[PDB]
Design a protein around this nucleic acid. Structure first.
Ligand SMILES: [Mg+2]
Ligand SMILES: [Mg+2]
Ligand SMILES: [Mg+2]
Ligand SMILES: [Mg+2]
Ligand SMILES: [Mg+2]
Ligand SMILES: [Mg+2]
Ligand SMILES: [Mg+2]
Ligand SMILES: [Mg+2]
Ligand SMILES: [Mg+2]
Ligand SMILES: [Mg+2]
Ligand SMILES: [Mg+2]
Ligand SMILES: [Mg+2]
Ligand SMILES: [Mg+2]
Ligand SMILES: [Mg+2]
Ligand SMILES: [Mg+2]
Ligand SMILES: [Mg+2]
Ligand SMILES: [Mg+2]
Ligand SMILES: [Mg+2]
Ligand SMILES: [Mg+2]
Ligand SMILES: [Mg+2]
Ligand SMILES: [Mg+2]
Ligand SMILES: [Mg+2]
Ligand SMILES: [Mg+2]
Ligand SMILES: [Zn+2]
Lengths: 64, 95, 211, 125, 25
RNA sequence: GGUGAAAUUCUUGGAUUUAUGAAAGACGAACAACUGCGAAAGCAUUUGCCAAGGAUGUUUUCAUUAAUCAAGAACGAAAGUUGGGGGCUCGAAGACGAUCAGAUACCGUCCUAGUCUCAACCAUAAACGAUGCCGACCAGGGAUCGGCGGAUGUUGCUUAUAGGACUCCGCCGGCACCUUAUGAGAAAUCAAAGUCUUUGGGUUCCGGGGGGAGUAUGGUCGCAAGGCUGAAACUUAAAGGAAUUGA
RNA sequence: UUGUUGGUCUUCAACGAGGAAUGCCUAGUAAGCGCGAGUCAUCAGCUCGCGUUGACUACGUCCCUGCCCUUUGUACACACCG
RNA sequence: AUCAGAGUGGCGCAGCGGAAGCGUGGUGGGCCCAUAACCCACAGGUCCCAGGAUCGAAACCUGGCUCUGAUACCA
């Protein structure tokens, strides 16, 4: 099974996608405040938003 | 017109240089002309180094690097952005 | 399908400080496919840093063959010596000369084995030159000395103390010091040892080397 | 307790193959194409990680805690670099909860090979 | 390589003409 | 497995994978270079043998024996031809799978001749530095390969030294490179493509608008494919080189 | 008069939110609502203005269509519809 | 002579009772500066003819019709 994990956008990196509709941010896990990983988010997002992750493992790559 | 003084390859005093196969398309390209890069890259990138560094049994374990010497024909190197079309003046720069 | 397999403990000979290399598993002894002498010839791959607990030699992959099985205890003798890929590909680099040698050699017990040795020229301090190459004649002088030494240092009593020359790099630094009035030669090693031919069983010798 | 994990991560697929310390017994062998349905995406890091988690479960039920890793590309007279699934397999076998004993590369590199497929002008598309 | 292929065409036509002349023997 | 995606293909007579070993044939990675050797084509695993070779060194020898070359001759990538050997890989032709309006293609699969080797042929390549060879003069510089000479100052070297490794300087000889006109050129560019209307060191080959055409014919060489030699009628006002501005 | 237009009664069609395609739009904006003027003896389903009610989404990108500048190739210059 | 086979959109073919299409051409739109390709629709039909059986037929049985292929041996 999977458990929904909760993360915080700590810095926002850029705008990926063909049409720039996706942002790339670095998130930080609230339970383990040592695991910082890259994710892609759809929709407006600033520094400090809390992102819900259905799975935690998937980690984006630079300029994905 | 003659684009370059070296003819596009590094051959002086020889008559024949053995060819090599392009790493992407297998095109035969002489060794002195192909675009040769030596890549020393890590086993995993830095987002996923520590969740292997914490799973090392031994203290002081150093994760290897992969070393590969990659050749490209002119077409594949140009298309893969390994080398770029430069201006007439900056073509002469070998640095 | 795994309720029919027993584990065995594999043991390396006493010339290696740390022992008990690991655990293998075979399938429960059935007549005709009895495990004990049915397999009897597994080869295992263990680093030398697990056999001497010093990390300055995490390269130098030891290959160990099974010569006997004593009741859930697989006895093991030395089969081969190699490098790890990362080690060898760190050593070869542009602007320097690589010297290769190999020789077929006999030890006093009828073991035929092939030694491959590798070296590279050393730049000195205060060198302003941008390369360090030998002249294919110095190359030949070094390779001649390299095979000479490699055969005179081998052909000693047993693989026991031959591997006791491999462990602390007697061959390598002896070769470096021997060819220094020819060319400096940093990073000299015995890159591979392939044993060409193993004579017989010789059961007593196996416990002479084991424990 | 140790088993050795041969990750053969080529393009078009990734194999996670865990075997004993002699390579002579298959503990569990799961490939990328088992965890997906479309051929295009067998090599995807997603299939690599699903196969990794599955072999993790099959291994911790066999008493092995720590795995020795032997990475491999296709090699031979072809590409020497691991595919897209090699990295994900290590990442997931490490984060899934298992120890990694030692890492090294087994891609077959000829000291020189036979001729490679395609012809003199190469695969041109 | 139209020059090369034109050369091939001329080669073919010359072979054909030779065959007519040798058949005339 | 393969691909952008697929299919042909293999597969519970177990494919792909893993491990140890054997056989076979081909290839000689990395080192490997604005580096070497060779008349060019070309030559990259070790060791041994055989003859050959350039450069350096020289207070050795001969004494003009030389340069370039009709005739004539040696060598000459790959493909190709004939016959043995071999036959891993890749693979003209071919058979299928796709793509497409069609696809006798590009892409994928299976493959024949071939690729390898021996004996005999063939004699052609963008066989290119698109630049024949010998000689003289002409500018600056730093590298680099071979040899030699001269320097104190250090080696994990060496019964001490000498020497080998490195540093600095110089001279011959190579492969090249960088900066510059006082030069040349239609310019691109070139330290030789300079020393040309202020035109003459020697010699061989070779061009005379574009096509027709490397064609026809005759000769000659070849087993053959073809090689060398090589027109005319007719036709046509441009074809072409370098650079500039635009698109 | 092939009904100018406005009234009265009667007649009660298609149309069940629309295939491929495609347009305009970033705040008092889109959309909804009506009013004025032009035309004008009469005729506004149009155009030009005006107020009224008043949002969704984004705060990007160069994927498609194009535009500007640079470098590059060119056998194009009526210029790639070459 | 007897028998097996085939008749379904203007053409070639598929259709397992619940019952109609595929491919190609036709007409009208779309895409493009335009033409082909390509996209979307709309119109097409005595399922060869007559019976019967059957919840239910172009299909199953029978009968008549038109085209194809066949066995036709000892004198
Ligand atoms: Mg030379
Ligand atoms: Mg050549
Ligand atoms: Mg198998
Ligand atoms: Mg050399
Ligand atoms: Mg080699
Ligand atoms: Mg074909
Ligand atoms: Mg010629
Ligand atoms: Mg020429
Ligand atoms: Mg020449
Ligand atoms: Mg020198
Ligand atoms: Mg010099
Ligand atoms: Mg003339
Ligand atoms: Mg002429
Ligand atoms: Mg031009
Ligand atoms: Mg009116
Ligand atoms: Mg009005
Ligand atoms: Mg109007
Ligand atoms: Mg071009
Ligand atoms: Mg050009
Ligand atoms: Mg023009
Ligand atoms: Mg056009
Ligand atoms: Mg139409
Ligand atoms: Mg059209
Ligand atoms: Zn390529």
């Amino acid at each position: 099974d999977t458990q929904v994990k909760l993360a915080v956008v700590v810095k926002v990196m850029g705008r990926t996608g063909s049409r720039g509709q996706v942002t790339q941010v670095r998130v930080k896990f609230l339970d383990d405040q040592n695991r910082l990983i890259m994710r892609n988010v759809k929709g407006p997002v600033r520094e400090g938003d809390i992102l819900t992750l259905l799975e935690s493992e998937r980690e984006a790559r630079r300029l994905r | 017109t003659f684009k370059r003084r070296n003819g596009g390859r590094n051959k002086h005093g020889r008559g024949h240089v053995k060819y090599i196969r392009c790493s992407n398309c297998a095109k035969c390209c002489p060794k002195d002309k192909a675009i040769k890069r030596f890549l020393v890259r890590n086993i995993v990138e830095q987002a996923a180094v520590r969740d292997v560094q914490e799973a090392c049994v031994h203290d002081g374990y150093v994760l290897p690097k992969l070393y590969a010497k990659v050749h490209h024909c002119v077409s594949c190197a140009i298309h893969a952005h390994i080398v770029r079309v430069r201006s007439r003046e900056n073509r002469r720069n070998r640095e | 399908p795994f309720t029919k397999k027993q584990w065995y403990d594999i043991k390396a000979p006493l010339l290696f400080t740390s022992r008990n290399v690991g655990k293998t598993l075979v399938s429960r002894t059935q007549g005709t496919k009895i495990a004990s002498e049915g397999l009897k010839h597994r080869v295992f791959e263990v680093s030398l840093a697990d056999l001497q607990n010093d990390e300055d030699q995490a390269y130098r992959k030891i290959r160990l063959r099974a010569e006997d099985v004593q009741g859930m205890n697989v006895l093991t003798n030395f089969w081969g010596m190699d490098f790890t890929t990362d080690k060898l590909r760190s050593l070869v680099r542009k602007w320097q000369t690589l010297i290769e040698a190999h020789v077929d050699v006999k030890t006093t017990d009828n073991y035929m084995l092939r030694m491959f040795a590798i070296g590279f020229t050393k730049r000195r301090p205060n060198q302003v030159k941008r390369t360090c190459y030998a002249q294919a004649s110095q190359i030949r002088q070094i390779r001649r000395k390299m095979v000479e030494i490699m055969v005179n240092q081998a052909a000693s009593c047993d693989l026991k103390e031959l591997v006791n020359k491999f462990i602390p790099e007697v061959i390598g630094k002896e070769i470096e010091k021997a060819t220094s009035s020819i060319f400096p030669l940093q990073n000299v090693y015995v890159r591979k040892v392939k044993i060409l031919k193993a004579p017989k069983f010789d059961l007593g010798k196996l416990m002479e080397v084991h424990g | 307790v140790f088993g050795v994990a041969h990750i053969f991560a080529s393009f078009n697929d990734t194999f996670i193959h865990v075997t004993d310390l002699s390579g002579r017994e298959t503990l569990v062998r799961i490939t990328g194409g088992m965890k997906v349905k479309a051929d295009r995406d067998e090599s995807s890091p997603y299939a690599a990680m699903l196969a990794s988690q599955d072999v993790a479960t099959r291994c911790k039920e066999l008493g092995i805690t720590a795995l020795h890793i032997k990475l491999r590309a296709t090699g031979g007279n072809k590409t020497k670099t691991p595919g897209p699934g090699a990295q994900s397999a290590l990442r997931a076998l490490a984060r899934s909860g298992m120890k990694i004993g030692r890492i090294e590369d087994v891609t077959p590199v000829p000291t020189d090979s036979t001729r490679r497929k395609g012809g003199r002008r190469g695969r041109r598309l | 390589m139209r020059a090369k292929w034109k050369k091939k065409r001329m080669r073919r036509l010359k072979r054909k003409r030779r065959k007519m002349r040798q058949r005339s023997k």
